[model samples]
Target: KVTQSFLPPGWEMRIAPNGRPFFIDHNTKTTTWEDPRLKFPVHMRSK
Candidate 1:
């Protein structure tokens, strides 16, 4: 795994499962109609 910091605050990033093939089985379907690739531990805030 690799990590890097950009010239910004409140904005951090990391790469997960790098150099690996991401696959989805045909039996799975997204009910929310959102991006299926999105994972947990999501960070966000409202103004």
Candidate 2:
């Protein structure tokens, strides 16, 4: 297990099953999304 106590104000971290790192913005209430291994059409994309 990993531990961190040095995050900046309003910031947090999350870890994936594969040990990938992600960041969260508490002020905005948003988190990171995964990048698809394959590209998709513009119409099939997300916001």
Candidate 3:
């Protein structure tokens, strides 16, 4: 299966209990479920 690859710099991959990886923002204390490289930014703007 395809494994998680580093999204470049300023981001880190952390493993969870599920054996999957999540992203941690280095610049800010906030975390990201979806990387900024995606069109989605912290989820949809919400209507």
Candidate 4:
């Protein structure tokens, strides 16, 4: 049998600005893949 190389349940892989490994919980329900910590100063119209 072959070994599976997938992440564990409820965990996602994210790349940080310093190229470090980051794991986020799936329960958070993020709108985008971008980092949630980094916020924009200006707000744009929503669809």
Provide TM-scores for the models.
0.20, 0.43, 0.46, 0.40
- Candidates ranked by lDDT, best first? 3, 2, 4, 1
**Winner by lDDT:** 3
Best by TM-score: 3
How well is each residue in 5-29 modelled by candidate 4, as lDDT tens digits? Answer: 2465676867668765566768775
lDDT score, residue 20, model 1? 30
What does candidate 1 score on TM? Answer: 0.20
Model 1 global lDDT (CA atoms, 0 to 1): 0.32
Compared to the true structure, candidate 3 yields what TM-score? Answer: 0.46
Off by over 4 Å in 2: 1-6, 33-47
Q: Residue 31 in candidate 4 has what lDDT?
A: 29
CA shift of 33, model 3, Å: 2.5
Give me the runs in candidate 3 sitting further than 4 Å from their true place. 1-4, 35-39, 42-47
What's the CA RMSD for each of the models? 13.0, 8.6, 4.3, 12.6
In candidate 4, stretches whose alpha carbon ends up further than 4 angstroms from where it belongs are 1-6, 28-47
List of clashing residue pairs for candidate 3:
none
Query: After TM-score superposition, what is the CA distance of residue 1 in candidate 1 from its true location, in Å?
Result: 20
